[PDB]
Amino acid sequence: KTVVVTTILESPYVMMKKNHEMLEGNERYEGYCVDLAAEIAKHCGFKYKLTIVGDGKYGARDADTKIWNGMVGELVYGKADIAIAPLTITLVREEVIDFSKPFMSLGISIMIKKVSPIESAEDLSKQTEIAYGTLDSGSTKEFFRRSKIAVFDKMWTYMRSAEPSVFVRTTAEGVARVRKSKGKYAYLLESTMNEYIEQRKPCDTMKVGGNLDSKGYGIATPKGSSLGTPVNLAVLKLSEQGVLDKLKNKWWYDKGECGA
Amino acid sequence: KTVVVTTILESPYVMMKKNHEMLEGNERYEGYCVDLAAEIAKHCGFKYKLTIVGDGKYGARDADTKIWNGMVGELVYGKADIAIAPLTITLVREEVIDFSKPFMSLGISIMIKKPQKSKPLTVERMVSPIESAEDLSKQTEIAYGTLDSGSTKEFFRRSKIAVFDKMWTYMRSAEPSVFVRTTAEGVARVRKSKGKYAYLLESTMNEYIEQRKPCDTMKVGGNLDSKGYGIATPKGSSLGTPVNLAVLKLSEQGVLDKLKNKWWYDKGEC
Amino acid sequence: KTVVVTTILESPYVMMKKNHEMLEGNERYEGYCVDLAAEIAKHCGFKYKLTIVGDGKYGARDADTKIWNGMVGELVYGKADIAIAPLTITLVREEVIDFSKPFMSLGISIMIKKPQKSKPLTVERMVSPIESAEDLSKQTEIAYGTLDSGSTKEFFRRSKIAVFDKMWTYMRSAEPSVFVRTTAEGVARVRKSKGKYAYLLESTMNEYIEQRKPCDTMKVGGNLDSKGYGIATPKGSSLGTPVNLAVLKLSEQGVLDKLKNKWWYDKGEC
Amino acid sequence: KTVVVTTILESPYVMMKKNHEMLEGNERYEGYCVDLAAEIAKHCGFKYKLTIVGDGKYGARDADTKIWNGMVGELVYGKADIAIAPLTITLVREEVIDFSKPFMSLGISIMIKKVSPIESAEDLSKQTEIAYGTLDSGSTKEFFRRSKIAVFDKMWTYMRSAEPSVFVRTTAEGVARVRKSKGKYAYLLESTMNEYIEQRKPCDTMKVGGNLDSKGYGIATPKGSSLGTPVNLAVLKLSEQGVLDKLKNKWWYDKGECGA
Ligand SMILES: NS(=O)(=O)c1cc2c(cc1Cl)N[C@H]([C@H]1C[C@H]3C=C[C@@H]1C3)NS2(=O)=O
Ligand SMILES: NS(=O)(=O)c1cc2c(cc1Cl)N[C@H]([C@H]1C[C@H]3C=C[C@@H]1C3)NS2(=O)=O
Ligand SMILES: NS(=O)(=O)c1cc2c(cc1Cl)N[C@H]([C@H]1C[C@H]3C=C[C@@H]1C3)NS2(=O)=O
Ligand SMILES: NS(=O)(=O)c1cc2c(cc1Cl)N[C@H]([C@H]1C[C@H]3C=C[C@@H]1C3)NS2(=O)=O
Ligand SMILES: N[C@@H](CCC(=O)O)C(=O)O
Numbered sequence A, D: 001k002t003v004v005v006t007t008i009l010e011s012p013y014v015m016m017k018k019n020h021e022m023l024e025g026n027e028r029y030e031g032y033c034v035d036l037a038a039e040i041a042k043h044c045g046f047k048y049k050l051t052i053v054g055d056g057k058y059g060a061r062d063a064d065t066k067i068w069n070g071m072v073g074e075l076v077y078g079k080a081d082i083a084i085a086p087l088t089i090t091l092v093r094e095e096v097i098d099f100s101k102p103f104m105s106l107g108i109s110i111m112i113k114k115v116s117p118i119e120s121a122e123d124l125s126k127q128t129e130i131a132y133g134t135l136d137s138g139s140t141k142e143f144f145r146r147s148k149i150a151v152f153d154k155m156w157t158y159m160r161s162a163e164p165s166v167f168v169r170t171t172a173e174g175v176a177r178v179r180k181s182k183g184k185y186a187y188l189l190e191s192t193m194n195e196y197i198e199q200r201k202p203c204d205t206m207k208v209g210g211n212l213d214s215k216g217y218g219i220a221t222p223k224g225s226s227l228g229t230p231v232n233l234a235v236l237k238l239s240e241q242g243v244l245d246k247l248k249n250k251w252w253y254d255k256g257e258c259g260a
Numbered sequence B, C: 001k002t003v004v005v006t007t008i009l010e011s012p013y014v015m016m017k018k019n020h021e022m023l024e025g026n027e028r029y030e031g032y033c034v035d036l037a038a039e040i041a042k043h044c045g046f047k048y049k050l051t052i053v054g055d056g057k058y059g060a061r062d063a064d065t066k067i068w069n070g071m072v073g074e075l076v077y078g079k080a081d082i083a084i085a086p087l088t089i090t091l092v093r094e095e096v097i098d099f100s101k102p103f104m105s106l107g108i109s110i111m112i113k114k115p116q117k118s119k120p121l122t123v124e125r126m127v128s129p130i131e132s133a134e135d136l137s138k139q140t141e142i143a144y145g146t147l148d149s150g151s152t153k154e155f156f157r158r159s160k161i162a163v164f165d166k167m168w169t170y171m172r173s174a175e176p177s178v179f180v181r182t183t184a185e186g187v188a189r190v191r192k193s194k195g196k197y198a199y200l201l202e203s204t205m206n207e208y209i210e211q212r213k214p215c216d217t218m219k220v221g222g223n224l225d226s227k228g229y230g231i232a233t234p235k236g237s238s239l240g241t242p243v244n245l246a247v248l249k250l251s252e253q254g255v256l257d258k259l260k261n262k263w264w265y266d267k268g269e270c
């Protein structure tokens, strides 16, 4: 029986290849996530099919609705069997569905135009001249929303009272807004995506400061599913063998079209 | 019913208080792990008593006997309820026990003696003989070893990478043995080897020891891999989910980071 | 019974919120003094409603007619219950009202326009024509004045010091008048006088204005004296002792320092 | 009727003159406090006599006894009519007796041997190599005892668990211990006393950092005394006329036997 998989067309995790207009099957996708899905299928021994959630969202909770959108929505409501995609792990999504062991560690990063006058996020909180935003229905905004730290509370109060809407539809739109703003707009995003933007043309954006926290990416599984343990063991096996690191290097630094 | 806690006397996770001879109960110990256990107890209501295993081993499967020892064995055989200690999540351990999400990131680093500054405007430059792991594998004059019954040794013995395979081959046939029995033993070997020995230990203890007096050691290279410290729980136990949720909540609240800077950098002078 | 609070719209003590047109109640105002009033209400249980006097004067005794105006007159005649505002403790005011312990230290400083840097290795040096008060008294090309119905003017008119007597003599017979009616008016006169005018205002507002955009003003010299901002209370009232104790408790707890840093330096770029 | 006044032999507030073995009356004392007392007596028009509390303490609350020592003890228990001395004003003493308006503003200062590696008190709290202490039965230790700030709580926990007893009998003993310790002992003391030590021989000590708080000195009066208002008005009048500042300069910088 073919197993349906939900994901999001995020680079370098998933790509559309180049001649996507004349490609079909599981060979029409290239990237970290599709290769990981193929490896998981080979290890478990099941046929898998890749699908993309119609809305370009990861998943969140609507106001006064209690409905899951994004990939977790497809997982919970019977529209998917496993989500192999860069889905951050937090407390809220852990209650509804179970996560495997993380396969990529990261944190909150600040990206800005190419010394930096803000450096630490403390100055950025204390300096309102440069704006800052996040991605809607992700995990960074959820982290900032319910943070009891004074600095993070001030940041979140800034985000909610922001004219116009500081949030963006996609991280590509976020970096586009950052580049077009000529350094007046900062982007709070995951470390991996920030570095990927940094190491590609035109190499105009750079990461500033350290990481505000520590997170990870997990392979979400429907609650009470028989496949959670096999895929968790497969993730651990890949981490032990270094296949995760090898694929990270393959899709991360093998090309390297920038001067670093 | 008060549950027991398995922990190892490892700095800065667990220390011994100065006035611990006259003190009993949970007041004997101090450090990162005791605060983590206190926060876990505050999150989910239960009574905890700190225990330290006699063998003082992290856990490994003995060959030709198939018997788990250390924390993993103590947890498997039902004589322990929780292991709030720097226990590394591995594939072999996940098959016997239940692991929550990692609460601390780590990597396999290298410990060597810090060289003296070279005299030859009036600035001092650092000279080192090791810059990565490939040169350590190629070079042979300085011996290198790992911790016995640890996660690093198990990772090295089951790695198909050429350089890691060469390191494992050297370690398994090195006379005298390059393996140590404790972290402090390895650090003492590094300090008293006069730069003739390299210790492969985790990055957290590495940086903690580097930042503390007499700060005569220094770490080289990056992390050989990426792993994390989890909280262990016996397979099919009712404490796994609440502990996992507590770890996630503590990570989100920033208490883990606060403990990290409290016990790692606030008490460092070098 | 809800008591009334007398305050002046002075920055950074009290500011007008951006969306105050559609907002009523205590939400209209923001700044140091509104937070001080909130902390006072939290300490001792009572209901407070912020009021701003129409005349907008601090308080002085009119000559030949003997009427107290401003906040002092408002509290003397019983139409107000408390004055949580930057009101200076003076000898003349203490004879008519009750003053608690000061909650902020201040001094009489000088406001002048900041000169441009001089071109003549590659460093920039600051040149100023005034370094103290004695040279200001000796020099006469640049006019200087104070605030009307303020504490500084009352201090100047009743000082036996020779230099201060000379300053008062110059001020009382200056054409056109060197006295301003508001702090903002004096700052505007300093900014638009092209360095031909000096303003004698308190050091707190002086440094707040200096630290804020467009940061085109700069303070010279030390404080002419030492005073403090108190909380006013009508003579023989039951609110004097609880307010004094609340001020002492807030000072001990460090809330006053936290408010000072929040509203004086955290919002400054120059 | 002669009014008795309690004080403490603290310099430059009160001196013993030089030929004290052959002096008597109110003319056997020189200094800021005796001159202030003479001015207050002249303004009010009453005969005053100066006395020193037998114990060299300002005043505090003993454990499980509720008895006032120091100068406030002499004031409360009918042994004095007014205390003209450098008595800091705080909440605890305000409840028992009333204080006039302050006549000298100051704060908590750190003194050390003659750039400084600690600078701010944050480093000193985070650096236990150099010890720090205060004066027993004063106001600095009371401020540190009941401070809810994390840094000040850490400092107070350090003071209580100090071997040997870090407290000193007198500020002169404190500066002696600081000088003999060769920079390994810091002294938390009032700004005025620290500066007075700074501006005298051998000019070996210097103040480090800013002020941890803001305080003041008041003329304590017995609770329910008819003299509180006249002396409060006299203090305000002296502050208005500049006599307080003039006496401060007279006993503070007129001599100036150091290189500044
Ligand atoms: N170097 S990296 O960010 O691509 C990365 C990060 C991580 C990896 C693997 C890689 Cl390649 N696996 C670990 C997992 C392996 C076992 C130990 C911790 C979890 C369970 N999580 S991690 O520390 O988040
Ligand atoms: N010790 S640390 O500051 O580097 C550190 C390391 C890690 C933290 C939190 C901290 Cl503070 N949380 C993550 C976990 C928390 C939740 C989000 C990812 C996993 C589940 N593991 S981690 O990546 O090992
Ligand atoms: N605005 S400030 O930080 O310089 C400042 C100034 C002063 C403060 C407290 C602060 Cl935070 N408290 C004192 C008062 C408080 C208690 C101790 C001395 C008097 C009674 N007045 S003050 O010397 O005018
Ligand atoms: N310059 S100083 O420290 O000797 C000093 C400090 C102060 C003085 C007078 C002097 Cl000389 N008087 C003021 C008082 C006068 C009136 C205004 C504030 C109080 C009531 N308190 S103060 O601000 O604590
Ligand atoms: N990649 C994150 C969202 C990124 C963001 O919100 O900044 C997630 O899957 O939740």
Ligand SMILES: N[C@@H](CCC(=O)O)C(=O)O
Pocket (backbone or CB within 6 Å): B058, B086, B087, B088, B147, B149, B150, B151, B152, B153, B200, B201, B202
């Ligand atoms: N922390 C390691 C042991 C120490 C080491 O391997 O260096 C573990 O949990 O196995």
Ligand SMILES: N[C@@H](CCC(=O)O)C(=O)O
Pocket (backbone or CB within 6 Å): C058, C086, C087, C088, C147, C149, C150, C151, C152, C153, C200, C201, C202
């Ligand atoms: N703050 C002063 C008025 C301002 C000034 O005099 O500069 C007072 O209370 O009288």
Ligand SMILES: N[C@@H](CCC(=O)O)C(=O)O
Pocket (backbone or CB within 6 Å): D058, D086, D087, D088, D134, D135, D136, D137, D138, D139, D140, D141, D188, D189, D190
């Ligand atoms: N001079 C202070 C005490 C000094 C100190 O404790 O440091 C007082 O009168 O309370």
